[PDB]
Amino acid sequence: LTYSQLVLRTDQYSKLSGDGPFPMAFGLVLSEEERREVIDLYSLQFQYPDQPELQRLVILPQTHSRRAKGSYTWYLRSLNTNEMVCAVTIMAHHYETHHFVEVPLFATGVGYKKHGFGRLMNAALLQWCVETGFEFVMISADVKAIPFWSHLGYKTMEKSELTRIVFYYEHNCYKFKGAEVMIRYCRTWPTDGVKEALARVQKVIVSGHVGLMD
Numbered sequence: 001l002t003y004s005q006l007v008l009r010t011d012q013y014s015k016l017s018g019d020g021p022f023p024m025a026f027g028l029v030l031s032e033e034e035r036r037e038v039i040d041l042y043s044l045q046f047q048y049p050d051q052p053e054l055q056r057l058v059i060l061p062q063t064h065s066r067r068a069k070g071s072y073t074w075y076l077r078s079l080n081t082n083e084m085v086c087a088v089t090i091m092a093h094h095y096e097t098h099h100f101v102e103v104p105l106f107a108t109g110v111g112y113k114k115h116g117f118g119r120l121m122n123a124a125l126l127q128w129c130v131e132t133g134f135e136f137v138m139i140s141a142d143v144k145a146i147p148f149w150s151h152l153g154y155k156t157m158e159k160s161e162l163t164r165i166v167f168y169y170e171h172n173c174y175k176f177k178g179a180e181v182m183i184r185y186c187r188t189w190p191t192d193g194v195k196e197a198l199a200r201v202q203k204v205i206v207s208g209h210v211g212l213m214d
């Protein structure tokens, strides 16, 4: 429900071996078709969340009316093959004066690893959080995920700051067993962060908005 347990799955060639460019486009999951495709990517990376739990987590955005709120899943698609390259699922929270985002799911797909798409998607999330009204991105980080989030600049949330939202967090946020709570404040995100992450993704050009839309 709001508790989980990260169980990761354990010869893999690069699908970007060609000269490029490889055109790619970001998308928001808005159809059952995209929902199925993102769940398929996740299901090859996770043992738990299992198939039912991925279907509970990856959903169409709320049919509501004024700030961003609720669940959103974005993906990056490789246009040559229509394959999903990576995907993130968030929950957007507005609690009293606290406006923040949590990230239950994040993965890069088979054949696309170690190309910079993880850094790129994280950069696109932080840029979206800045542009919408969010103050920070909060991560429930299983022991196996801490080094990754840490490398990308998330830090262990200080206890005094967690205690300010601890009640709302324990009752509303998606908590992985044994996790550490990590955080990046959006005021620390550089304006050129997406530009620099994309520059590092070799042989890729992005068509459409270079970032996440809602």
Ligand SMILES: CC(=O)SCCNC(=O)CCNC(=O)[C@H](O)C(C)(C)COP(=O)(O)OP(=O)(O)OC[C@H]1O[C@@H](n2cnc3c(N)ncnc32)[C@H](O)[C@@H]1OP(=O)(O)O
Residues within 6 Å of the ligand: 006, 008, 045, 103, 104, 105, 106, 107, 108, 109, 112, 113, 114, 115, 116, 117, 118, 119, 120, 145, 147, 148, 151
């Ligand atoms: C659901 C959750 O929230 S769990 C959080 C993580 N998700 C998962 O574990 C799902 C399965 N794993 C994956 O999908 C991938 O291994 C990911 C998403 C962790 C990383 O995807 P990649 O495509 O390897 O990321 P990318 O190539 O963009 O790497 C970004 C940078 O992080 C580094 N990095 C990648 N994985 C790790 C790791 N596990 N620990 C530390 N650093 C890492 C890379 O070396 C790279 O460094 P650089 O930019 O300084 O050169």
